[PDB]
Design a protein around this ligand. Structure first.
Ligand SMILES: Nc1ncnc2c1ncn2[C@@H]1O[C@H](COP(=O)(O)OP(=O)(O)OP(=O)(O)O)[C@@H](O)[C@H]1O
Ligand SMILES: Nc1ncnc2c1ncn2[C@@H]1O[C@H](COP(=O)(O)OP(=O)(O)OP(=O)(O)O)[C@@H](O)[C@H]1O
Ligand SMILES: Nc1ncnc2c1ncn2[C@@H]1O[C@H](COP(=O)(O)OP(=O)(O)O)[C@@H](O)[C@H]1O
Ligand SMILES: [K+]
Ligand SMILES: [K+]
Ligand SMILES: [Mg+2]
Ligand SMILES: [Mg+2]
Lengths: 550, 545, 545
C-alpha cells in the first residue's frame, strides 16, 4: 500500500524475484531424491515432497509479490486438475524459458523463440510412445509414479492387463482393514452430473441412488429462453403419459443455466403427489461436451439409458410410448459423475450393437487418421460404453496412512489411464534434450530451409541457448551423483543422444530410461512445455503491476 | 492529511508526476511490443492489455495523487461508455498536449494552441470517411479485426452488404455443428421492458410472447401522483372502447414508480374476465431524448400522449390495436411480424429523420444530436440476426464466438462512427495539413505565421502527431532504415505504416488498418480539454469537511 | 510474518536449532536421576520428569520454530498413545540420526544409512525376549517402569502370575481408603452399547441386567433404507421361531441411525405380550475392523449376518438363545456367567487367532495388524479386574493411579511384544553386532565394507548407540573421570550398567533392568523416519491461504 503502481525495471525485478523463489522451492522436491517442504496450517505441519502441494501452498507477504505468484502457480495447479501430474516440470520450464526470453529481448526474437519451441513441442508429440494394457511398460510407468511401490504397480498393472478387451474405470474408498480389497462391477462411469445441488437426495448435492428412471437426452444449451418449452414439456408428460413412466424423469442436456434450473425446481413443487422420500422426480443433468465432439457423447448417454435423442426442448411435447421408455435398472447420480450398475441383458445387446457401429467407423479410415483426435475420441466413447467399473477399498494400519495410500493409488490410476490414453516418453529429463537437439539438427540439416533457419535461431544464439535449457531437468536430477563429473560437467554428444544415459535414483544403477524403466506420461511433459512457454512469455512481457483495489 | 491545501509549483508537480505515471502505464499497452499489466482484485490476478481496463483500475495511495488521477482517467472511461473505443489515445494526447501548454506558458499562447488544435479537429472531421455497407472497406476492417480471417470477414461483410437498407443487429449462440448456421429475421430490438416482473407470463419476469396488442405511449414519469389518472384511463377504455381492442393493453412510458405499478396490478384484478392463460391484459413498459418514445409509438401504431389524463379523451380515430407479433422481455422487447401496411409508416418516418440530418452543419454531423438520430434510424430499420457458431471442440467454438463478437463490434462502430486511416497517421496528416493550409493561404498567412509558426507552436504540434506512429512503430524494421526524421512530402502523400499482425509495410488504406472517426476525433477533443485543465490548475484541496 | 518462505541454509538452521532445544529439554529428564521441568498453565506450575508431558507441552514463539517443533514432537506423542512408553528415546535418536544424515550428505549415503539402520532394527526384533506370566522378569520390568516401587511391582506381577491361563484386563478407579482394594471378575468388557437410551431398563439409558438372551450380529450400518428389512426380520422370528427363543432379542450391529431406532421402538410396542417388567424384548447395540463383531458373535453364540434381510432365512440350526448372564450399558456391555460349553467355543476361537500370528513375519509381529489381533484375544480371554487405588491425600492417590496405569501398560506390552535388556545397552549390542555380521560374512563383506565401513558411516553409527548409555551413566562411578568408557569385546559379552536406584554396578540381566521391546524398537523406527524428514527438508512455508 506504500505504492500501488509498479512500472518497468521495478516490476520485472519483482517478477524475477518471485519466480526465483518459487523455482528454488518447487524444484527442490524433484524426483524421489526430492527434498522436503514443511507447511503450516493453523496448528499442524504437513511435511511433503509433492510439487503440486508445495506450489499451491506457497504464499508471499507483499501484495506485489503474491500478485505475480498467482500467475506462476495457477498454471501448475491447472496441470494436475487436467493431466494428473507434472506441475514441477511446468514451473521449471516457466523459469528457464522466462530467462531465455529476457536473454534475447526485442519482439522479433520472441516471435522466433515461440516458433522454435512450438516446433520442439511437435517433435515431442511425435516421440510419444503409445501402448496396450498387455505391454510391460505400464508397470514401469506405474512404478515411477507410485514413488517406487513394488507392491501397487503390480496390482494395478495386473488389473489393466487382466481385463484385455475392456478399459477399467477405477474408484477409491477409504477401507477398514490392513489389507486392501477389490470389487469388480459391471458399472459405467457416465459423464452426467447434477445441474444444481437442490435436485439430489437431501436437497444438497448428495449421492442419490435409484432403482428405476425415465431419461430424456436434449442437445441444446439451456437458459432463460427455454423456460416455457420446459413447462409445456414436463406437464405434457406428467399429465398425458404418466401411466408408462418410472420416476424420476432425468433431463440430460449440454448445459442448464440458472434461469432454467429455478424453473424446474418449481415444476417439482407443482406436483407434490409424485415426491417419494424427498427425491425430486425431475433432475437436470449437464455434461462437459461442447462442439460436434459434444453431440456424440450425449448419444452414448442416450443409448445406455434407452432415452431418445432430441434436438430441441420443444420436442418434449410431441412424444408417445414409441419414443418414451422408462428403465427399471439401477443408477447412482452424483455431483462429479453418475454411475450405472444394473444392466438387463436386453440393454447390453443395444449397447454392444452401438459399440460395434463405432468400431466399424474406425475400420474404414486412413492409418494417419488412426492417431487423430477424431479416432482417439471415438475410442474414448467405446470405452465409456464397454467399461468395467472397479471399486478398490484401500486399507492400512492407521487413518492417515490409509488416506495417504488412497492418494498414491489415485496418482497411479491417473498415470496409467493417461499413459495408454495419451502415450509414454522416456524419462530422466531426456526426451526434451532429444526433442530440442533433434529439432535443431532437422532444420540445420534440411538444405531447403537451412538458409533462413540459421539466420533466425542458430546465428542469433537462441538455438544454442535452447539446447542448454533441455539439460536443466537432467542436471537437477543427476548433479551431485556418480553420473556427473565432480566439477559439474556432463557431455551431451552424439553418442549420448543415440543411447541416453540416466541413473535410477531408487537403485543407483546407470543405464537408459528404456532399460531402467523410467518413463513419463507424454501429456504431462508436453503440457508442461506448452504451459511453461505461455506463462514464461507472460512474465517476460509484463511491465506493470497494479495493486489498486478501488 | 499532513497538509490539505497544495498551491503552485507543488500542485503542478503532483499533476506532472501522476500524468507521467498514468501515461507510461496506459501507453505501454499499445503495439507489437505491446506490454501487459497485472491487476489485483482480492485474491486474483487479471493480466491485460486493454487500455480502458488498465486506466479504470489504476490507483494511487496519496489522496493528492488520486485526486488528479480521477481527472485524467474519468475522460478515458467516458470515451468507451459513449464511443466504444479509444481511451489509450485520449490519455496519450492528454499527456502530449499538457506538456505543449506548459512549454508555451502565458495565456495568449494557450488561446492560440486551443485555436490551432480546434482547427486540426475540423480537418479530421472533414477527413472522416462515412462508410456504407456496400463499401469494400468494411471487409478490410473486419479482416484486420478478425486476426486475418479470410472466411469470417467475408461472411459478416456479406450480411451487412446484403441487407442494404437495414442495419443488422447480430446475436451469437454456442452452436452444435462443425459448421456455422445463420437465422435471419425482420425483428427490431426495441428499448422497452417490463416495469415489474409480475406483468410477465407466469408472473415472474419471463418472456411473454404475443400475436396481438394495443399500445399507448405516454411521456411523463409515473409515480404516486398518477394513480388516479390511470384508474380513470384504464376503465374508460375497457368499458367504453372494448369492442375495438386486442389484448393486452401496453402502457409504454418513461418510468413507472412502484406506487403506480401496484395500482395497475389491482386494475388487472378488477377485470378477471379478460385474463387469457394467466397473461395480464395490461403491461407497463419503461425505457432508459423524448423522441425515442416517438419511435416506439410509430413502430406499434400507438398514439403519442403528453399526459396520463389524456387516456380518457380518446376514440377509434386515436385507438389502433395491432394484430402483429411481439416478444416482451425484462431486458428488452422484440417485434417480429410487421404487415407491409406498417412498414410503409416506418420507412416514411425514417425518411423524415434522414431529411433532418441533410440540412445541418458538418461540425454538428459528429455531434451527439446527429449520432443519436442515426441511432433512431437503425432501431427503426433493423433486422435481428442470430448466428450459431460451431467447431470441432467446445473451447474452439467458444473462442470462435469471441472472434465473431470482435468483428461485429468492429463493423458496427465502423459504419456507425465513420472510418479514418489508422496507424497513427490521420493525425499527422491533419496537423501537417492544417499548418500548410494557413501557411499557404496568403490572405491570412501574415498573422498565422505570427501566432503559430514564428512562436514555435506549429513546429511543436507537428512533433506531437508523430507520437502515436512512433509508439507503434519504434523498435521495428520501418524505423531501421531512415529513422525518426522522414515525415517528408513523399510520406504525406502515401503514408507508410506496418501491419503489426503480419509484418508487411504499406499504406493504412492498402493494408486495411482503419480507426473509427468518432473515437480518434473525441480522443483529440477530450485530450485537449483535460490537458488544458491539468495545465491550468494551481490548487489542490483535500479538505473533506 | 516478516517473511513467509524460508529456503535452504536458513531453513535447516531453524531445524537444527529447534531440534537441539527440544533434545536438551527432553533428554534432561531421562532415567530416575532425570532432572525436572516446570510447566506453566494459566495459574499453576506442573513440576515433572515425564518425557511425554515435557515433549507435548514445549512451545516456541516463532511460527517457523513451532512449525518444526510439531514435526519433532508429534512422533513422540504418537508412541505413548500406541506403545505406552518411550518418547524420550525416540527424540534422542531423532536428534542423533539427524546429525548422522547431515554428517554424510548426498543421497547415496542416505540410502545406505537407511539400509544399515533398518538392519539394526531387525537385529533388535530378533533380540526381543518373549515372556510368560509365570516368568520372574515381569516383576523386574514392572519394577523399572514403576520408578522402583517394591510394593506395586509385586502386586501386579502376582495378579498376572496368579491368573496363569487368562490375561487380566485391568481398570483403575480413584478409591477412598489409605489401602488399595482389588475386585476380580470373570467377566468380559465387550464393546457393544445401547443405540438409544429408550431400550434400557426404565427406558432412560440405565444398566439393564439380564440372565438370558438371543443375540444376532449384523455387519451393515443401519439407517432409513433398512426399516422394512427389520420389520420383515423381527416378525419372522417372533411369529415362526418364538418357541426356541429367550428374551430379549439383541440386535448387535455397526451403527443404528435414528430412522431405524424409532422403527424398532414400535416393533416392541407391536408385541406387548412379550414385555417383562418394562424390559423391552429387543435392543439395538452399536460398536465403534469388521472382525471385532465376529468376536462379539462368538462370545454370545449368535450368528454372523452380512445383510439385514438375512434375518428371515433362519432356522434352529442358526438361532441359538443363551441362558447365561449379561449386563448391558450405555458405555459398554459386560458378560459374566459363561457355561463351560461356551468357554470351549471361545478358547477354540482364540487359538485360531493365535495360530494366525504364529505364522507371521517377525517384522509384522510389531505391526498394527498383529497388535489389533492381540487386542481381540484379550477381549476374548480376559478376566476383568478393577483396582481402586488409595492413599493419604487426593493428589497422592491420583498420582498413584497414574503410576499403576504406567505399570499395567508396561506389563501388558512386555508379554504381548517382548522385553530387552535395559541401560541403553541393547542398541549398542544391536549395532556392534550388525556391523560384525556383515563385516564377517565373506559372501557380502566385499560390498558391505564399501558402503558402510569404508565410507565412515559404520564407525559413526556405533558411536550413536553409546548416546543413551552415556546420558544415563556419565557423571557416575561407572565412567572414568575424564568421560571415557570403553566398549570393547569384553563389555559386549557381559555389558555393564549401573542401577540408578541402588548404586550397584552389574549387567541389566543381573540387576533386573529391562525395557519393553516394542517401545525401544518403535523408538528407533520412528527416530529414523523423523530424522530423515528433518535432514531432508529445505523449505518452510508459514503462508496461510
Ligand atoms: N527412479 C528415477 N530415476 C531417475 N529419474 C526419475 C526416477 N523417477 C522419476 N524420475 C524423473 O523425475 C522427474 C519427475 O519429477 P517429480 O515426480 O518430482 O515431479 P513431476 O513428475 O514433474 O510432477 P510432481 O512433482 O507433481 O510429481 C521426471 O523427469 C522423471 O523422469
Ligand atoms: N534403575 C535404572 N538404572 C539404569 N537405567 C535405568 C533404570 N531404570 C530405567 N533405566 C533406563 O532409562 C531409560 C528409560 O528412559 P525414560 O524412562 O526416562 O524415558 P523413555 O522410557 O524413553 O520414555 P518416557 O520418558 O515416556 O518414560 C532406559 O534406557 C532404561 O533402561
Ligand atoms: N495491425 C495493426 N497495425 C497498425 N496499427 C494497429 C493495428 N491494430 C490496431 N492498431 C492501432 O493501434 C491502436 C491500439 O488500440 P488500443 O491499445 O486498444 O487503444 P484504445 O484502447 O485507445 O483503443 C488502435 O486504436 C489502432 O488504431
Ligand atoms: K515431486
Ligand atoms: K523419564
Ligand atoms: Mg513424477
Ligand atoms: Mg521409562
Amino acid at each position: 500500500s506504500q505504492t500501488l503502481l509498479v512500472h518497468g525495471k521495478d516490476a520485472q525485478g519483482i517478477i524475477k524475484q518471485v519466480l526465483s523463489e518459487v523455482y528454488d522451492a518447487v524444484t527442490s522436491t524433484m524426483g524421489p531424491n526430492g527434498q522436503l517442504v514443511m507447511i503450516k496450517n493453523g496448528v499442524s505441519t504437513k511435511t511433503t515432497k509433492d510439487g503440486v502441494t508445495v506450489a499451491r501452498s506457497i504464499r508471499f507477504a507483499d501484495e506485489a509479490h503474491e500478485l505475480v505468484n498467482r500467475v506462476i502457480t495457477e498454471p501448475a495447479t491447472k496441470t494436475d486438475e487436467e493431466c494428473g501430474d507434472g506441475t514441477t516440470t511446468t514451473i521449471m520450464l516457466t523459469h528457464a524459458l522466462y530467462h531465455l526470453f529476457k536473454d534475447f529481448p526485442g519482439f522479433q526474437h520472441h516471435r522466433n523463440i515461440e516458433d522454435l519451441v512450438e516446433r520442439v513441442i511437435q517433435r515431442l508429440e511425435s516421440m510419444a510412445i503409445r501402448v496396450e494394457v498387455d505391454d510391460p511398460r505400464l508397470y514401469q510407468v506405474a512404478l515411477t509414479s507410485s514413488n517406487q511401490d513394488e507392491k501397487l504397480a503390480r496390482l494395478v498393472s495386473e488389473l489393466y492387463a487382466n481385463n484385455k478387451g475392456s478399459y477399467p474405470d477405477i474408484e477409491l474408498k477409504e477401507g477398514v482393514n490392513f489389507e486392501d480389497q477389490i470389487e469388480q462391477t459391471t458399472g459405467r462411469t457416465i459423464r452426467m452430473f447434477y445441474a444444481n445441488p437442490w435436485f439430489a437426495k437431501g436437497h444438497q448435492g448428495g449421492v442419490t441412488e435409484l432403482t428405476g428412471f425415465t431419461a430424456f437426452v436434449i442437445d441444446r444449451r439451456i437458459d432463460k429462453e427455454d423456460t416455457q418449452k420446459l413447462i409445456d414439456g414436463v406437464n405434457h408428460l406428467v399429465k398425458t403419459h404418466k401411466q408408462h413412466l418410472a420416476l424420476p424423469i432425468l433431463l440430460i442436456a449440454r448445459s442448464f443455466e440458472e434461469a432454467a434450473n429455478s424453473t424446474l425446481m418449481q415444476l417439482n413443487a407443482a406436483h407434490p403427489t409424485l415426491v417419494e422420500d424427498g427425491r425430486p422426480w425431475l433432475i437436470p443433468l449437464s455434461t462437459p461436451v461442447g462442439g460436434a465432439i459434444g453431440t456424440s457423447e450425449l448419444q452414448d448417454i442416450a443409448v445406455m439409458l434407452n432415452a431418445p435423442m432430441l434436438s430441441d426442448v420443444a420436442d418434449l411435447t410431441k412424444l408417445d410410448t414409441h419414443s418414451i421408455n422408462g428403465q427399471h435398472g439401477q443408477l447412482e447420480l452424483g455431483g462429479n459423475r453418475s454411475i450405472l450398475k444394473s444392466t438387463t441383458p436386453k440393454d447390453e445387446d443395444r449397447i454392444e450393437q452401438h459399440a460395434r457401429g463405432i468400431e466399424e467407423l474406425l475400420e474404414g479410415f486412413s492409418l494417419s487418421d488412426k492417431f487423430s483426435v477424431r479416432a482417439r475420441y471415438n475410442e474414448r466413447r467405446i470405452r465409456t460404453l464397454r467399461g468395467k467399473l472397479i471399486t478398490i477399498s484401500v486399507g492400512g494400519e492407521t487413518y492417515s496412512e490409509v488416506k495417504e495410500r488412497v492418494d498414491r493409488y489415485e496418482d497411479v490410476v491417473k498415470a496409467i489411464r493417461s499413459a495408454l490414453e495419451n502415450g509414454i516418453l522416456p524419462g530422466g529429463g531426456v526426451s526434451l534434450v532429444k526433442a530440442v537437439f533433434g529439432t535443431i539438427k532437422e532444420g540445420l540439416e534440411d538444405k531447403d530451409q537451412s538458409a533462413e533457419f540459421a539466420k533466425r535461431y542458430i546465428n542469433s544464439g537462441i538455438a544454442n541457448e535452447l539446447m542448454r535449457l533441455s539439460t536443466i531437468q537432467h542436471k537437477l536430477l543427476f548433479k551431485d551423483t556418480a553420473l556427473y563429473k565432480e566439477n559439474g560437467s556432463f557431455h551431451f554428444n552424439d553418442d549420448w543422444l543415440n543411447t541416453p544415459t540416466v541413473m535410477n535414483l531408487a537403485t543407483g544403477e546407470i543405464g537408459t530410461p528404456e532399460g531402467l524403466g523410467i518413463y513419463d506420461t507424454a501429456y504431462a511433459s508436453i503440457t508442461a512445455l506448452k504451459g511453461g512457454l505461455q506463462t514464461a512469455k507472460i512474465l517476460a512481457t509484463t511491465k506493470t503491476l497494479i495493486l489498486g483495489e478501488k
